Design a protein around this ligand. Structure first.
Ligand SMILES: CC[C@@]1(O)C[C@H](O[C@H]2C[C@H](N(C)C)[C@H](O)[C@H](C)O2)c2c(O)c3c(c(O)c2[C@H]1C(=O)OC)C(=O)c1cccc(OC)c1C3=O
Ligand SMILES: CC[C@@]1(O)C[C@H](O[C@H]2C[C@H](N(C)C)[C@H](O)[C@H](C)O2)c2c(O)c3c(c(O)c2[C@H]1C(=O)OC)C(=O)c1cccc(OC)c1C3=O
Ligand SMILES: Nc1ncnc2c1ncn2[C@@H]1O[C@H](CSCC[C@H](N)C(=O)O)[C@@H](O)[C@H]1O
Ligand SMILES: Nc1ncnc2c1ncn2[C@@H]1O[C@H](CSCC[C@H](N)C(=O)O)[C@@H](O)[C@H]1O
Lengths: 338, 350
């Protein structure tokens, strides 16, 4: 049939079961020596009968399976919730850490389609980044999720750009500094500056120090809506612009253009797609998180020309690049003065 | 060293996990149903503009929702402007007999109730329902103070009530039965199937406020009101009337052990000599319970109400605790579902 296909697609059960299995460290406790439902219940601090009801469903959707009678063991797919796995999917689905917490915003998607405005504040009391400002808790969990891949996520985009005439790089909203770090060990003559918010700057400083790069890369606390701290031959916006509606994203773009030295470029590292090619799960899954968390968006190639020009810029070239960690393709846009 | 941009090793399993864990997808389906998007399409809306007008949404955000409905296979582009339901998307039409638009409608009782899954970890820690922490009252008190939710719950359950009770009504010989009491009997569909099968029998449906008016007008319209009364009450309290057969159709799964024993005792107290208590529900062997068609109802029951589906062995202990015994279970096999409904017949312990 395919009335079972519709029920599967509309199932709230399943993702909530995946996410509670992750929050409870379920797969980790089985691998650590929890053979029985009783031991698993002890380790997770759950009721044995209700845990068995959770594992019924974890078996049905393919994440656990019975080996011996009443003895449950992670499948290939279930093993991906192991906390030491490099894709960190367990963290990304933990209801205590920042991203899965924010997905609760989807419970009010109808509002966001009605208004075009984010849902997050109506649930948690503040807009997304102000919330993180007042919870060191989720500040740190968010930074660690997005930089879970730090050591390799930026190797490819840095390899695809020519750094020969670049003396200084500004990484605007550059996270824990990973993109600055990848450009640095790719191009030894280059120095860099990371601009980020409070919390994230201290964590960026310690990561850069621990890479051996504190002499080549500074971190500066600030606000990319105000003038940028320095001038630069290349300015990076990796996963920033999608957080903001058009007007805000043109303001950020415009501040970057003002900070560009003669001949420099701006590199945008997120995701886009030709309009006709945009009707896919990768583009939609991020575009809609951006709507509901932030009032942001992903933008098509065509829509990027419009934003570029509002900021006195042209889109010069676009490559697509694969993530080394997760099933997802990224885009690197290079923008020049018009 | 040179850079090589490999994809991750276990990338197929990774997209399987990421897909299964995604909340946006079931929410996109559910907002499509609530917006009645597919009925607006089938009723002549061809542009995003016209759909945005009928749904009362902002065109640009509606196109974004529509984007993901295409990727998942519920909508497609027939022509550059217009979007149209697939074979699968067609089931979100409101007059489809499987009723999935209504089951996924965030404005109606069950899908609204599903938000309770957002706190499933509490339910696994405590064994206790989540619905009250979200919506302020427990499940049936909420419906009681919310006439629209009361009616949408009743109308979802009574879906095929013209037909769905025909089998359970035939799973009992009504010869030595004068009166049947259906405890929590919905809009009176089970009482109706019994009544046109067994001309000699009278029945009373016991139900809550709201549901009773709806049961009354359905029974009136079947031409059966001279044969079937309806009585507003509480099955935790003494029952309106003694009876020869007392029905409990998809009630006990709503309740934890101790509440279902209280209900079963109330049924036993109202029972005439030689009469029987008939539970219409499921009776699945634990060995056949590791599938979505069991866990969906069972976990809804955990999180909405603190209830459970009860496997084969569990009923003997529930019955005994009410001073009853399971004489036998009659299966109700059917081609539409991989599992069996059952009719458990209960007598007094001695
Ligand atoms: C499942 C795919 C993905 O992981 C893709 C992307 O994450 C990518 C890029 C990360 N990065 C460099 C920022 C990192 O390399 C990660 C492993 O993959 C990404 C991603 O980039 C973000 C989010 C994702 O869920 C994901 C992931 C997703 O689409 O889940 C539905 C956010 O939720 C998010 C929330 C709030 C603000 C944000 O912007 C700063 C993001 C965000 O950038
Ligand atoms: C499509 C599958 C199903 O309909 C199965 C079941 O319905 C049963 C009993 C119906 N009935 C008598 C009302 C119907 O006649 C048929 C025998 O299937 C049922 C079902 O029985 C219930 C629910 C379902 O979704 C379903 C459906 C389902 O789980 O969808 C995946 C509830 O949501 C629900 C919510 C709150 C309280 C409830 O208890 C009274 C229920 C409930 O009983
Ligand atoms: N007004 C503001 N000023 C400076 N940074 C901001 C900001 N608003 C949000 N940000 C930052 O921009 C970042 C987006 S996410 C991290 C992106 C990082 N470049 C990466 O690709 O991994 C967040 O780290 C957040 O700290
Ligand atoms: N205290 C109470 N007294 C009478 N009915 C109650 C009740 N608590 C819950 N119920 C009812 O029990 C029903 C469970 S669901 C509907 C069951 C119906 N017999 C059927 O097979 O479709 C609900 O209709 C609800 O109204």
């Amino acid at each position: 049939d395919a009335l079972r296909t519709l029920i599967r697609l509309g199932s709230l059960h399943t993702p909530m079961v995946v996410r509670t299995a992750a929050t409870l460290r379920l797969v980790d406790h089985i691998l650590a020596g929890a053979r029985t439902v009783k031991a698993l219940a002890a380790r997770t601090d759950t009721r044995p009968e209700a845990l068995l009801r959770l594992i019924r469903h974890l078996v049905a959707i393919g994440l656990l399976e019975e080996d011996a009678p009443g003895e449950f063991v992670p499948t290939e797919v279930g093993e991906l919730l192991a906390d030491d796995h490099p894709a960190a999917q367990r963290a990304w689905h933990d209801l205590t850490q920042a991203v899965a917490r924010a997905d609760i915003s989807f419970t009010r998607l109808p509002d966001a389609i009605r208004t075009g405005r984010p849902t997050y504040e109506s649930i948690y009391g503040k807009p997304f980044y102000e919330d993180l400002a007042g919870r060191p808790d989720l500040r740190a969990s968010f930074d660690s999720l997005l930089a879970c891949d730090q050591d390799v996520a930026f190797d490819a985009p840095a390899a695809a750009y020519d750094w020969t005439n670049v003396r200084h790089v500004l990484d605007v909203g550059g996270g824990k500094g990973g993109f600055a770090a990848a450009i640095a060990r790719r191009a030894p003559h280059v120095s860099a500056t990371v601009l980020e918010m409070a919390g994230t700057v201290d964590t960026a400083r310690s990561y850069l120090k621990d890479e051996g790069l504190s002499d080549r890369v500074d971190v500066v606390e600030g606000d990319f809506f105000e003038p940028l701290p320095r001038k630069a031959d290349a300015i990076i916006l990796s996963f920033v612009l999608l957080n903001w509606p058009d007007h805000d994203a043109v303001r950020i773009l415009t501040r970057c253009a003002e900070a560009l030295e003669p001949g420099g470029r701006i590199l945008i590292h997120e995701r886009d797609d030709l309009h006709e090619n945009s009707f896919n799960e990768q583009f939609t899954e991020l575009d809609l998180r951006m709507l509901v968390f932030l009032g942001g968006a992903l933008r098509t190639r065509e829509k990027w020309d419009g934003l570029a020009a509002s900021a006195g810029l042209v889109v010069e070239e676009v490559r697509q690049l694969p993530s080394p960690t997760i099933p997802y393709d990224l885009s690197l846009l290079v923008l020049a003065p018009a």
